From TrEMBL, chain B:
The gene is H3-3B. This is Histone H3. The chain holds residues 11 to 18 of 92 of the full protein. The nucleosome is a histone octamer containing two molecules each of H2A, H2B, H3 and H4 assembled in one H3-H4 heterotetramer and two H2A-H2B heterodimers. The octamer wraps approximately 147 bp of DNA. Belongs to the histone H3 family.
Length: 111, 8
């Protein structure tokens, strides 16, 4: 059932965004500040874009939702040098997001 | 490997 699944994904997305304590992943990487970003990153992702995708019915199973969270992280590791707060924040986001995604998947796989 | 972002 689409409606309760979307409610679950909204809740899960809020839980993931609460882990972004640096407010680093909440909106697209701004090309005005990072002009070469697209030379390197084929599919940019961020929590605002995930919210738009959610309401546009782009996530119809948990896997596709989790895939895009994982892209937030992997894009950041790929673009930024290891010594940067951006890279380190992405490592932390992955670590903190794990439990959120694990629990939410079980709730989805009860439906 | 990239331009980088400005230090936060």
């Amino acid at each position: 059932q689409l409606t309760p699944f979307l409610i679950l994904l909204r809740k899960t997305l809020e839980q993931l965004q609460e882990k972004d304590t640096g407010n680093i992943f909440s909106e697209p990487v701004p090309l005005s500040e990072v002009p070469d970003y697209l030379d390197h990153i084929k599919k940019p992702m961020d929590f605002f874009t995930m919210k738009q995708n959610l309401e546009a019915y782009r996530y119809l199973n948990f896997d596709d939702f989790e895939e895009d969270f994982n892209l937030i992280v992997s894009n950041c590791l790929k673009y930024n040098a290891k010594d940067t707060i951006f890279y380190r924040a992405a490592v932390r986001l992955r670590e903190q997001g794990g439990a959120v995604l694990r629990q939410a998947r079980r709730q989805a796989e009860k439906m | 490997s990239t331009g980088g972002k400005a230090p936060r």
